[PDB]
Write a protein that binds this ligand. Structure first.
Ligand SMILES: CCCCCCCCCCCC
Lengths: 29, 19, 381, 49
């Protein structure tokens, strides 16, 4: 069963974005 | 110029509301 | 009711940008040092709201993220409370019981004693209240009393926010001048709404402003104005900062116009880069209750000559006197001085005005340069 | 100039993975409201980024 897959992607993608692009401490460093 | 301004304003408002 | 030219001038202000959200520094960095950059803060807002929603849904990772955010927020709040307590203790230590006093407002030179009435404006420092109080100075005041009449309150907030994320930016300003004879009450309010963010879509913002004016003894009539403006970026390109606004003005006695003179205006604003020209344009049309006025402002820049600034204005009355104005500005550095020139040309009156400001801080060479008026000055009897 | 007699320009062929295609074909995103909402959110974010 693959009903959940998209959800497991979304909670990943934005989270990864938070780590890689819109992180203010990383930008400061 | 009044008709053109009114039409442009209406079109811009409709385009902004569509998105 | 003011003429349609006033409304057309008000509407054709230029390229606008509504105010965004405000962010805490402790929570955003999770206790680490951060810098300033837009797009990474509204992203944090919407991201934390979405993660709260997902955690409520049941996703464990969202729960972990929200728990970490809550821990950071609690630590920041406790740190700020401790800092406030320490600051209060230090203030008590410095001055045992004496509250801090404020410097009085300096009005200027006059034949009356300059040090007089200074005691009246020297008050104890107020607490950390949300409102901001400013005094208003009238043109002509009483000869033997202070010339400060009235007051103005300014307030800002971002309510409907959870843990410092989200909310609705809201600004308020009220000027009140009340005496035994007259009454002047001018209120203004601004509200901001955000629909989407670059990560989750386009930049869509809506600003609603409402301003009312009351002058009781002289005018005996009140005026209301309500304007709604919508801004979106990249409508016809990568970035165009498109904006459209609608304003309604009413001069009714109270509440609804009740046959009061109404006025409806609409404005459009956009900036575009074509070749070597970055052109910003704002055009508006206003109709009062039945003449209609049109206004347009444009700012034009040339990248090969960055020192020159060019502004064009076109105003058309009801059909149909068209007034065109062109303003050019330039700057340069002379010998130990800086000279800035401005040329304004109007075709309606066929007039050209040239102004040159000069500043020198090294010596008085420019003073010896200009000596014609001394000879030009004659007693003439 | 021998390619003038015989010129067979074959290109633009797009190869699609069998496993990935089957996996994403077996996914039903539109028969339920919650799945549709999650798919809409992911589609918005992916198209944006
Ligand atoms: C809630 C739906 C999003 C779009 C709302 C647009 C409201 C402003 C349009 C009318 C003023 C020009």
């Amino acid at each position: 069963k693959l009903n959940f897959v998209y959800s497991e992607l979304f909670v990943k993608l934005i989270k990864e974005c938070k780590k890689r692009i819109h992180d203010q401490t990383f930008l400061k460093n | 110029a009044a008709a053109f301004a009114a039409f442009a304003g209406f079109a811009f408002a409709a385009f902004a509301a569509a998105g | 009711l003011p003429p349609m030219t006033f409304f057309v001038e008000q509407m054709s202000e230029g390229v606008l940008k509504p105010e965004g959200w405000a962010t805490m520094e402790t929570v955003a960095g999770l206790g680490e040092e951060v810098t300033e950059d837009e797009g990474a803060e509204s992203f944090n807002h919407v991201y934390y709201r979405q993660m709260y929603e997902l955690a409520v849904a049941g996703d464990p990772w969202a729960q972990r993220e929200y728990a970490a955010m809550l821990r950071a927020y609690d630590k920041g709040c406790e740190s700020y409370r401790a800092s406030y307590e320490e600051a209060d203790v230090d203030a008590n230590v410095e001055y045992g019981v004496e509250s801090y006093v404020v410097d009085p407002i300096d009005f200027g030179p006059s034949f009356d004693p300059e040090d007089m009435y200074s005691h009246r404006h020297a008050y104890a420092e107020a607490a950390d209240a949300g409102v901001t109080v400013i005094p208003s100075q009238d043109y002509y005041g009483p000869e033997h009393d202070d010339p400060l009449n009235g007051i103005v309150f300014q307030y800002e907030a971002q309510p409907f926010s959870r843990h410092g994320w989200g909310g609705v930016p809201f600004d308020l300003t009220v000027c009140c001048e009340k005496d035994k004879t007259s009454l002047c009450l001018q209120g203004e309010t601004h509200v901001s709404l955000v629909h989407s963010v670059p990560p989750f879509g386009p930049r869509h913002i809506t600003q609603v402003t409402g301003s009312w004016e009351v002058l009781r003894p002289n005018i005996k009539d009140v005026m209301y104005q309500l304007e709604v403006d919508t801004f979106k970026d990249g409508l016809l390109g990568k970035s165009d900062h498109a904006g459209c606004g609608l304003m309604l003005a009413r001069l009714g006695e109270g509440g609804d116009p009740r046959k009061g003179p109404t006025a409806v205006g609409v404005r459009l604003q956009d900036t575009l880069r074509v070749g070597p020209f970055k052109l910003e344009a704002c055009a508006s049309k206003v109709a009062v209750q039945k003449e209609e006025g049109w206004g347009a402002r444009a700012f034009v820049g040339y990248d090969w000559l960055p020192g020159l600034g060019m502004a064009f204005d076109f105003i058309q009355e009801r059909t149909r006197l068209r007034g065109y104005g062109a303003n050019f500005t330039y700057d340069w550095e002379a010998l130990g001085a800086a000279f800035g020139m401005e040329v304004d040309y109007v075709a309606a009156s066929e007039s050209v005005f040239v102004s040159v400001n000069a500043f020198s801080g090294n010596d008085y060479r420019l003073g010896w340069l200009l000596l014609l008026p001394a000879v030009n000055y004659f007693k003439e009897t | 100039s021998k390619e003038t007699n015989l010129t067979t320009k074959y290109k633009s062929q797009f190869i699609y993975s069998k496993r990935w295609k089957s996996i994403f074909s077996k996914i039903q995103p539109l028969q339920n409201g919650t799945t549709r909402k999650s798919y809409q959110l992911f589609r918005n974010v992916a198209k944006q980024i």
